[PDB]
Design an enzyme around this catalytic site. Structure first.
Site, mmCIF file in Angstrom:
data_model
loop_
_atom_site.group_PDB
_atom_site.id
_atom_site.type_symbol
_atom_site.label_atom_id
_atom_site.label_comp_id
_atom_site.label_asym_id
_atom_site.label_seq_id
_atom_site.Cartn_x
_atom_site.Cartn_y
_atom_site.Cartn_z
ATOM 1 N N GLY A 1 -2.218 -0.767 6.273
ATOM 2 C CA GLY A 1 -2.093 -1.746 7.339
ATOM 3 C C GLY A 1 -3.170 -2.817 7.230
ATOM 4 O O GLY A 1 -3.429 -3.337 6.144
ATOM 5 N N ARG B 1 -4.078 -1.903 -5.037
ATOM 6 C CA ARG B 1 -3.584 -3.277 -5.011
ATOM 7 C C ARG B 1 -3.667 -3.790 -3.581
ATOM 8 O O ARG B 1 -2.855 -3.408 -2.732
ATOM 9 C CB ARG B 1 -2.158 -3.369 -5.557
ATOM 10 C CG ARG B 1 -1.752 -4.781 -5.954
ATOM 11 C CD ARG B 1 -0.544 -4.783 -6.878
ATOM 12 N NE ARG B 1 0.713 -5.039 -6.187
ATOM 13 C CZ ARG B 1 1.875 -5.212 -6.802
ATOM 14 N NH1 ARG B 1 1.974 -5.151 -8.120
ATOM 15 N NH2 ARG B 1 2.965 -5.450 -6.079
ATOM 16 N N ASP C 1 -2.812 3.791 -4.183
ATOM 17 C CA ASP C 1 -2.778 2.756 -5.202
ATOM 18 C C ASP C 1 -4.057 1.924 -5.109
ATOM 19 O O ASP C 1 -4.965 2.227 -4.331
ATOM 20 C CB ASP C 1 -1.522 1.901 -5.050
ATOM 21 C CG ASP C 1 -1.493 1.134 -3.742
ATOM 22 O OD1 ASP C 1 -1.717 1.750 -2.679
ATOM 23 O OD2 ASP C 1 -1.251 -0.090 -3.777
ATOM 24 N N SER D 1 2.721 -2.265 -3.595
ATOM 25 C CA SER D 1 1.770 -1.397 -4.272
ATOM 26 C C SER D 1 1.838 -1.648 -5.771
ATOM 27 O O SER D 1 2.798 -2.230 -6.282
ATOM 28 C CB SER D 1 2.041 0.082 -3.970
ATOM 29 O OG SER D 1 2.191 0.295 -2.578
ATOM 30 N N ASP E 1 7.923 -0.415 -5.396
ATOM 31 C CA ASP E 1 7.548 -1.123 -4.178
ATOM 32 C C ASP E 1 6.652 -2.298 -4.535
ATOM 33 O O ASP E 1 5.652 -2.130 -5.240
ATOM 34 C CB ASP E 1 6.835 -0.199 -3.186
ATOM 35 C CG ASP E 1 6.315 -0.942 -1.972
ATOM 36 O OD1 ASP E 1 7.134 -1.521 -1.229
ATOM 37 O OD2 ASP E 1 5.084 -0.946 -1.761
ATOM 38 N N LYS F 1 -8.618 2.541 -1.951
ATOM 39 C CA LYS F 1 -8.187 2.730 -0.574
ATOM 40 C C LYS F 1 -8.539 4.104 -0.022
ATOM 41 O O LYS F 1 -8.156 4.419 1.110
ATOM 42 C CB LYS F 1 -6.677 2.491 -0.462
ATOM 43 C CG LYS F 1 -6.250 1.124 -0.969
ATOM 44 C CD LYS F 1 -4.744 0.951 -0.950
ATOM 45 C CE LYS F 1 -4.353 -0.421 -1.473
ATOM 46 N NZ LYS F 1 -2.879 -0.604 -1.507
ATOM 47 N N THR G 1 0.827 -1.201 0.000
ATOM 48 C CA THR G 1 0.000 0.000 0.000
ATOM 49 C C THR G 1 0.865 1.257 0.000
ATOM 50 O O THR G 1 1.849 1.343 0.731
ATOM 51 C CB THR G 1 -0.949 0.031 1.217
ATOM 52 O OG1 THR G 1 -1.834 -1.094 1.164
ATOM 53 C CG2 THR G 1 -1.772 1.308 1.229
ATOM 54 N N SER H 1 3.512 0.694 2.583
ATOM 55 C CA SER H 1 4.748 -0.016 2.265
ATOM 56 C C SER H 1 5.672 0.840 1.404
ATOM 57 O O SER H 1 6.845 1.035 1.742
ATOM 58 C CB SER H 1 4.429 -1.338 1.565
ATOM 59 O OG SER H 1 3.770 -1.119 0.331
HETATM 60 MG MG MG Z 1 5.546 -2.205 -7.552
HETATM 61 MG MG MG Z 2 3.735 -8.206 -10.177
#
Ligand code: MG
Ligand code: MG
Ligand code: A1A9B
Ligand code: MG
Ligand code: MG
Lengths: 196, 222, 222, 212, 204, 233, 195, 82, 196, 196
Positions: B47, B19, B17, B169, B166, B33, B1, B129
């Site tokens: 979280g 995901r 994001d 995300s 990252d 989100k 996230t 994250s």
């Molecule tokens: Mg990524």
């Molecule tokens: Mg992937």
């Protein structure tokens, strides 16, 4: 975290840094570690940010009720409120708080409350992670009944040394001056106190 | 996230994001989100997704009740204080980390709240994250007196950094703008840079491929 | 406190054909929630039409691949430059892995090539050397996501002849090189969609009786 | 994993499954758990996959060495004790192997030994080792007879492996069946459990709880 | 010993053109030992369907509690509960025991009676709603189901094709899981017709 | 080494059209104490290789001595140590990586993350990474510690693929490196304002800049931050 | 642990329970009836943690008897099984949960059908033709799956249980000192004189 | 020498799942010849010559003469001794 | 554990050993001879950790046979007991000790006297009229202490061991699947055809 | 323990306290924490007394052998010997050592080696428990090329503050001055440095 409070002839000055880190990452580099619980009673907080914020909020509530009911509280009264909240909940709190106030009766006063809820009244008090690095300097450079300029300079030099040595401290030096004239907020940026 | 919030001259924008991951597996490739505490007070969560959703809905319901009681527009400081007190009450066991922005009678507000009950104020904030990657963009491109489009671009670029650099995300970018004079505009999937390429082959099975032992109609009516 | 092992993610897949073999892998190397590289190949040509990959701990994988290449070099040196048969290479890799039985190479190993009869062959090894020749085998992070799919489209599992009411199973066939390439790309795209450790790129090594060739394909970077 | 071996008038019957799992994830269902040590000796792979495979192949190499040194087939007891001494020398080091060495020699006849990583070496008549050893033990102990024909003994071993594969979650895949006579071992086919279940259910009148 | 992996099982729901599908395995066992091959995991309240994966006792308790709540809902509102309302009810009921959670993984599927919109959603053990339009998976073979679905699915499937797709996904995922299988059921749900078919699979 | 004592923070490096750039702060941290300043963590080897070490400073000095000894040994009986038979970046890397993987396998590693950056004899840019686990990976952008989290996105915005390397100029790469150093000083508690930066260009050679400082910092907005929510003064 | 087996033949339910209770290195009793007659046409066998088993069984027995007295009616075996499952499910998350596994065998007079329920200490209820609690199943099932027919008579079920008991007495590391066998049919619950 | 040759053959089989080449076996045997002198050495070289015959898939049928001089030759026909 | 019993009558030593070997929840074999004939007039029964028992017993057997071959003489039971006790005592402080408990029954032909020795995995040797290893003693001793007489015949000792086996089959949580009984007398070591 | 070494124009001065405590009990209050490894190369020790004493003895042996073979060693040479001994045995040592030397070529030099074996050359170095309390003061009061008196005063003030704040330090301030004139040993008692 590096915090301090010094009593000078005109009143008191609280000083702190602005670096709050979760581990080695600087979570917030503009943190205002100086919190107001009453018009001329402020506190420097160190330790658990959640714990310190909750304690400060509850103390502000209690002091507002005290003001509404029985008038302006003494600095010692805010110190005792902080002490009660910290000592009775010592097993679930991780906070060290310096409380600085100015009232015309008792001039300016500083009370440091470390872990455990003990309360100690001192002419000047230092606390936080970086304090350990400036215990000597302060003891060699502190004087009673200083002027505003020299007290600001003392706090600035102490916090600059603490920031330089302690990685947990940093950012900008924030000071709150409590005097008869009122409350003044001063900020000193790294390009100033690093060259000291 | 990866969630970010940026204040501009006439309000505040948040972005996130889309995901949601169950460990190393992508559970939802388009999980919004950005939650709505009040019509013009929004927050991005990170979280424990269930904890974030639940505390946001609870504080939003209580804030709506507070507004119907006081006949005044909801205030960001009120939601902030209520969230902080509840989280501190449950001693961080509610794993919610929020970036709460809003516009109220007092003006624009952007705060961050951690699970244990601490709160921070700032002009640009990042949580989650990829919060570091996004922050790298923020500290690189943030300036005072940002315009609406400038702050939107900065938040979208921070979320894109969190998406690309990252593993926590990815996918698309949701944005929510809250200006002082207008209603809050909630751009769901403001940017969609992760469109899946067309599959090399279709796997539509010929009917009757699966072996069936018995079929029976089930009466759903009463 | 020192953990001598680490996870670099990644996913590899080997499919054996009638007159060919294919060993493919994602080119993404990661650590925790960060990306270390977007093109760090793990499918290496070791000569003698033997492609090898050891997915998992990148250090142990590189070490095992280097040791096997050295073993092939010394095999040529010591035995009149005799070509290393794929079964001989598999047994040598079993012994290499079991040499560190109590300090295992935290890598799942897959090799591909052509057998002595000219047929395609793929061998799979657990970290300590348990080896088996199989038609298709995937290893790594997205292994659990790809191996069932293969069972449905490579070995025609659970697929029965249409209209036979599950009496006659689907007739097995040898997939063309184009078909196995399609299947590998679809598997890796799905893995990138549902796994955070798979993406960036897919590198395929194709071993035919004319040698080893390469095929690179971009993948999503989220 | 479910492995079984039993000696009868016709020789030795060995029957294993083919499922290899890493927890709840079946790593493979094409695993060969009968290791052809030599044309006259067989081993069952129950326990650690690599441990059993590697050490039984090493046992086969040592048996070939013994035959080259003594110009005579190695006795089942000798090979079983070689493996037992090896695993006892590796005791406590982390090996996990419960195997059966089965052979048919002139001096010993049909002989089955159970060798485990704890060093236990036991000569026996009916042995089941693995996660589903209990089910195969039940089936065999209920329907075992020394006077069984080769056909009936093969079917009994297959049916015990089938019961294990059905009830046990860690056993399944396919059944490998071997028949060992004095002239060596004979492979009797790999039977997919998926189809074998329906065949046995229809022909035997068993597995009535399952619907099909 | 993982409460979600003591009994085992898998459920997967998918969508198509004016239709939904929800399928589950029929296996119940005490870890290695399989106990029952008749443990169905897809229950129905009105025209909404709920598949629960995880600890079997919690599955049954949730089925009974949700039947209770949906019956009271119908008696109060005098209307059948819709899939979205039931999804919110499941989420709230799960989060109500946040610190003493039910070790389950609910999945809701159905078709909105008034709008005709096919709707599926998933949950974790604490009620986080996962509203995907393509497919929702849960159980011990969650990763295998994820792979099968992300590989096979294409939107706007007719019921006869969506059935084949979801059945193949469920079967090839259950054959890759030691704790799933021993039978399977698939519900194809249309606006006015819901059919339930038992699948033939390996019993190992 | 089982637990690092004096530690070195992040190291960053990237590729550009004519070579590589690497940089690292000059801070030796005794845990949370910023104990030592002016600690050079970039070690030049010859005229074509720079090694950036992050981690235990004692092991870093050990690797310094090892590199010096490697140079001395390559000088032995080698009349071509000035030309064809000089230490290439790939040689130095592969040696360090072998050493690191061996130390890992002996359960006594060198608590370090090393980035070797240079230009080969044929002009190709060499940039690779190793750590206490012996893991080796190479990318147009490479960083250690907080660098790998924060500098990598900024540096990848400049060179996301190999195709972006020919287009990137030395000025662009150096500006990106300086911006990454500033960002780390912003958000890394164990960072230093003083750092060093090496540029290995296949034409210009080895340029080594010491005593650099982070400049153009934005701290004015800190004056407007008051309290943590409801406070106004 | 203790042996708890159950089989459902046509128009009957047979329950077998070990006669042995052993605490420590000494077998305290070789004649323990691990069953409780919940109702004239519903019996429950139990095994598990010492003390909790008998307590839970007698509690369920008292509840079922009180229900039968209040309504002057015998609850169906399905209702009793659901009640016991709810009790165990409430227990699992209590302060000190019940660690008791039960087999309920009843004869539904309304359906005139035999019913066998297996419930564990967690509240996992299943209706099965053959069931077992503990390690017993690990053997017995393999036999039953082969030799069980739905149309089996009560004597055939007794012979099948005897084969299961023989297999248990052969390949089990413990001597459960025989089994008490009880038959539940339309005429009630009777105890086999000797097994 | 015969023990070492047998062990080398079976060890190559175990390592490579294949039969050892005849020339490889002869070379491995000859490698022991000059490992003598004054515990990696023996007292004296061998006092026996060997005719090693065999067959492999690479070079078909092969005959080798192996001397205690560590040297081996491929003969189409070879006689040794008195 | 496994049942290992031994009794010393006026002109014989009787040894009883469990026939059961169980690994896990499955009894692998119900006909296991847990004894090793060390010498023509000395038998040793063993029990304990899997693998270590047979290994230690066969090692002792090989050593005793080698001594008997070298010196063309059978060592007295006391010498064999002392040798095995020294072996076990050296084992206890090794890297991986032997976890084997043994009963040695012999007939000293030079003295023409029966002798029974009990040694544990630690090397604790005692000469006793009746001995047992494991939990077995906890029952058997109570019987023997009452029903053992020094002038007992071999049939009386067999009946006493049968009573002990009955008590064990009654009050033991394990089914040791009977006992193999062996008699050591002046004429060597013989096996009772049937004991139940 | 509080130790430091300062380089001034004429040479170097090492300073330390004299309090060695086993826990909270002052084991020795007259400890000589300044150890000689060569005529004008000395070391301040902190940490495990056994470890520091063994390291110093071995360094003295190596430096005596170096003197016997190749002449007077450089300060850097003793620093490198300390570095080798500490770094190679880091997993079994808990010692922090400051090394101060004077050689006519390089005047005076100071090398601090903390835990882990890292070696850092510094104009002035501080170490020990009390050092954390004087990190600020020193950085604010240290200058290069001071005089002998000013260096003695700097070390005295720093060690006095460290002793005041750190309970692990105390006793008397011991100094060793290494210059071209030679070696001078100075002692300052509590009644002097407490009033500073
Ligand atoms: Mg990524
Ligand atoms: Mg992937
Ligand atoms: C195959 C026929 C019978 N044998 C089995 O069937 C058994 N082994 C396997 O499946 C797989 C094979 C595969 N390709 O998956 N072995 C591994 O994974 C390897 N583990 C590892 O490297 C690891 O340490 C990592 C954590 C895993 C990535 C080898 C190994 C190592 C130590 C062991 O103590 C065992 C196996 C072990 C012993 C007894 C029974 C079992 C074992 N391990 C289990 O997983 C099992 O339980 C299964 O029964
Ligand atoms: Mg399955
Ligand atoms: Mg099964």
């Amino acid at each position: 975290t590096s915090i301090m409070a010094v009593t000078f002839k005109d009143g008191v000055i609280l000083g702190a840094d602005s670096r709050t880190t979760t581990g080695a990452y600087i979570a917030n580099r503009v943190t205002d570690k100086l919190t107001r619980v009453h018009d001329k009673i402020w506190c420097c907080r160190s330790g658990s940010a959640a714990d310190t914020q909750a304690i400060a909020d509850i103390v502000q509530y209690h002091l507002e009720l005290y003001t509404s009911q029985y008038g302006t509280p003494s600095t010692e009264t805010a110190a005792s409120v902080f002490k009660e909240l910290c000592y009775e909940n010592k097993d679930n709190l991780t906070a060290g708080i310096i409380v600085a106030g100015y009232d015309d009766k008792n001039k300016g006063e500083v009370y440091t409350i470390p872990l455990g809820g003990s309360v100690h009244k001192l002419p000047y008090a230092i606390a936080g992670s970086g304090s350990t690095f400036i215990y000597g300097y302060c003891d060699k450079n502190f004087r009673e009944n200083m002027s505003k300029e020299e007290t600001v300079d003392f706090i600035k030099h102490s916090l600059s040394q603490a920031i330089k040595w302690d990685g947990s401290s940093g950012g900008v030096i924030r000071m709150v001056v409590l005097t008869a004239a009122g409350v003044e907020r001063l900020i000193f940026y790294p390009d100033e106190y690093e060259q000291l | 996230t990866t969630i970010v919030g940026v204040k501009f001259n006439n309000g505040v924008v948040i972005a996130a994001d889309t995901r949601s991951t169950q460990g190393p597996i992508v559970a939802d490739k388009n999980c919004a989100k950005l939650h709505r505490i009040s019509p013009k007070i929004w927050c991005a969560g990170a979280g424990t997704a269930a904890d974030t959703e639940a505390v946001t809905q609870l504080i939003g319901s209580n804030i709506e009740l507070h507004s119907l009681y006081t006949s005044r527009e909801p205030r960001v400081v009120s939601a902030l204080q209520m969230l902080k007190q509840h989280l501190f009450k449950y001693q961080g066991h509610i794993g919610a980390y929020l970036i709460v922005a809003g516009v109220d009678p007092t003006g624009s507000h952007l705060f961050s709240i951690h699970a244990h009950g601490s709160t921070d104020v700032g002009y640009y904030l990042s949580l989650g994250s990829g919060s570091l990657a996004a922050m790298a963009v923020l500290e690189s491109h943030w300036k005072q007196d940002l315009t609406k489009e400038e702050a939107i671009k900065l938040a979208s670029d921070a979320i894109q950094a969190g998406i690309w650099n990252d593993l926590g995300s990815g996918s698309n970018v949701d944005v929510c703008v809250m200006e002082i004079g207008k209603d809050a505009e909630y751009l769901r999937n403001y940017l969609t840079p992760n469109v899946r390429e067309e599959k090399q082959k279709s796997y539509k099975f010929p009917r009757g491929t699966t072996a069936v032992l018995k079929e029976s109609i089930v009466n759903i009516c009463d | 406190q020192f953990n001598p092992y680490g996870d670099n993610g990644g996913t590899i897949l080997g499919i054996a054909g009638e007159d060919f073999a294919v060993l493919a892998g994602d080119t993404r190397n990661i650590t925790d929630y960060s990306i270390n590289s977007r093109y760090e190949p793990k499918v290496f040509d070791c000569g003698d039409n033997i492609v090898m990959s050891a997915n998992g701990f990148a250090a142990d994988g590189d070490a095992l691949v280097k040791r096997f290449k050295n073993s092939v070099k010394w095999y040529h040196f010591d035995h009149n430059d005799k070509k290393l048969s794929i079964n001989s290479a598999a047994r040598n890799i079993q012994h290499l892995l079991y040499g560190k039985r109590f300090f295992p190479y935290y890598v799942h190993t897959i090799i591909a090539g052509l057998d002595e009869d000219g047929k395609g062959a793929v061998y799979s090894f657990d970290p300590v050397g348990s080896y088996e020749r199989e038609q298709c085998r995937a290893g790594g992070a997205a292994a659990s996501l790809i191996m069932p799919f293969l069972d449905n489209q490579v070995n025609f599992k659970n697929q029965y002849e249409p209209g036979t009411n599950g009496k006659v199973k689907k007739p097995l066939k040898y997939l063309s090189v184009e078909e196995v390439i399609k299947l590998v790309r679809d598997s890796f795209t799905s893995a990138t969609e549902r796994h955070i450790q798979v993406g960036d790129g897919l590198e395929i090594l194709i071993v035919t009786k004319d040698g080893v060739r390469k095929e690179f394909y971009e993948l999503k970077r989220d | 994993t479910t492995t079984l071996a039993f000696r009868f008038q016709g020789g030795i019957i060995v029957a294993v499954d083919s499922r290899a799992t890493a927890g709840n994830w079946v790593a493979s269902q094409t695993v060969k758990k009968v290791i052809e040590i030599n044309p006259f000796l067989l081993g069952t792979m129950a326990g650690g996959a690599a441990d059993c495979q590697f050490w039984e192949t090493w046992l086969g190499s040592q048996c070939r060495l013994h035959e080259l040194r003594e110009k005579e087939r190695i006795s089942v007891a000798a090979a079983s004790k070689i493996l037992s001494n090896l695993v006892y020398q590796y005791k406590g080091a982390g090996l996990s192997m419960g195997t059966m060495i089965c052979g048919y020699t002139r001096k010993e006849g049909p002989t089955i030994y159970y060798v485990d990583s704890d060093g236990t070496r036991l000569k026996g008549d009916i042995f089941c080792v693995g996660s589903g050893q209990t089910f195969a033990y039940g089936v065999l102990d209920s329907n075992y007879k020394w006077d069984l024909s080769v056909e009936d003994a093969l079917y009994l071993g297959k049916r015990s492996i089938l019961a294990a594969a059905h009830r046990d979650a860690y056993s399944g895949g396919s059944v490998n069946l071997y028949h060992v006579t004095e002239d060596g071992w004979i492979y009797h086919g790999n039977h997919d459990v998926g189809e074998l279940f329906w065949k046995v259910k229809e022909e035997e009148g068993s597995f009535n709880n399952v619907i099909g | 010993s993982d409460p979600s992996s003591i009994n085992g099982g898998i459920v997967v729901a998918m969508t198509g053109k004016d239709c939904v599908a929800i399928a589950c395995d029929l296996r119940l066992g005490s870890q290695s030992l399989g106990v029952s091959n008749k443990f169905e995991k897809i229950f129905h309240y009105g025209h909404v369907f709920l598949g629960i994966t995880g600890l079997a006792t919690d599955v049954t308790t949730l089925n009974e509690m949700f039947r209770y709540k949906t019956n009271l809902y119908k008696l109060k509102e005098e209307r059948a509960i819709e899939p979205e309302t039931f999804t919110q009810l499941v989420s709230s009921s799960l989060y109500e025991r946040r610190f003493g959670p039910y070790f389950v993984g609910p999945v809701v599927a159905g078709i909105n009676s008034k709008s005709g919109k096919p709707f599926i959603a998933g949950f974790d053990l604490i009620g986080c709603i996962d509203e995907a339009k393509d497919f929702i998976v849960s159980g011990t073979a969650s990763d295998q189901l994820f792979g099968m679905c992300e590989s096979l699915y294409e939107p706007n499937l007719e019921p006869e094709d969506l059935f084949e797709t979801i059945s193949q996904a469920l079967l090839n995922a259950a054959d890759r899981d030691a704790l799933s299988g021993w039978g399977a059921v698939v519900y194809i749900i249309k606006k006015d017709e819901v059919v339930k078919r038992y699948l033939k699979m390996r019993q190992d | 080494t089982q637990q690092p004592i004096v530690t070195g923070t992040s190291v960053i490096s990237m590729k550009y059209d004519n070579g590589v750039i690497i940089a690292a702060d000059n801070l030796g941290s005794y845990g949370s104490l910023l104990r030592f300043n002016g600690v050079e963590r970039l070690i030049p080897v010859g005229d074509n290789t720079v090694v950036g070490i992050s981690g235990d400073i004692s092991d870093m000095q050990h690797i310094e001595r090892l590199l010096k000894d490697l140079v001395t040994e390559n000088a032995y009986d080698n009349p071509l140590a000035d030309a064809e038979e000089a230490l290439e970046p790939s040689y130095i890397f592969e040696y360090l990586a072998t050493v690191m993987y061996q130390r890992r396998s002996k359960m006594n590693p060198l608590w370090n993350a090393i980035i070797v950056a240079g230009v080969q004899s044929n002009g190709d840019q060499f940039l690779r990474y190793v750590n206490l686990l012996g893991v080796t990976y190479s990318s147009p952008t490479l960083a250690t510690g907080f660098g790998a989290h924060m500098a990598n996105p900024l540096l990848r915005k400049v060179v996301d693929r190999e195709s972006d390397i020919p287009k990137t100029t030395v000025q662009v790469a150096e500006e990106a490196i300086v911006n990454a150093m500033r960002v780390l000083y912003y958000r890394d508690a164990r960072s230093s304002r003083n750092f060093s930066l090496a540029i290995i260009d296949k034409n210009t050679g080895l340029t080594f800049k010491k005593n650099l400082q982070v400049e153009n910092m934005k701290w004015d907005f800190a004056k407007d931050i008051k309290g943590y929510g409801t406070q106004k003064i | 642990m203790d042996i708890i087996l159950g089989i459902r033949v046509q128009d009957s339910v047979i329950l077998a329970s070990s006669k042995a209770v052993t605490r420590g290195i000494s077998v305290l009793k070789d004649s323990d009836d691990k069953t409780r007659q919940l109702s004239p046409h519903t019996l429950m066998s139990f095994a598990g943690e010492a003390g909790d088993t008998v307590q839970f069984a007698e509690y369920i027995q008292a509840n079922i008897q009180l229900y039968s007295i209040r309504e002057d009616y015998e609850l169906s075996p399905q209702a009793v099984s659901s009640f016991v499952r709810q009790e165990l499910a409430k227990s699992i998350r209590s302060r000190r949960p019940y660690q008791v596994n039960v087999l309920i065998g009843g004869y539904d007079k309304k359906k005139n059908k035999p019913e066998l329920y297996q419930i564990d200490y967690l509240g996992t209820k299943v209706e099965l033709p053959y069931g077992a609690h503990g390690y017993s199943g690990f053997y017995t099932f393999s036999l039953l799956d082969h030799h069980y027919r739905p149309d089996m008579t009560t004597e055939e079920g007794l012979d099948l249980l005897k084969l299961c008991v023989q297999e248990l007495e052969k390949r089990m590391p413990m001597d459960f000192k025989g089994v008490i066998v009880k038959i539940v049919d339309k005429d009630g619950i009777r105890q086999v004189d000797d097994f | 020498m015969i023990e070492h040759a047998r062990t080398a053959a079976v060890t190559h089989n175990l390592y490579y799942d294949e039969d050892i080449n005849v020339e490889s076996l002869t070379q491995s045997v000859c490698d022991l010849a000059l490992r003598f002198g004054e515990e990696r050495l023996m007292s004296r070289p061998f006092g026996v010559a060997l005719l090693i015959a065999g067959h492999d898939a690479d070079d078909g049928y092969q005959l080798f003469h192996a001397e205690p001089s560590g040297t081996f030759y491929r003969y189409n026909a070879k006689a040794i001794g008195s």
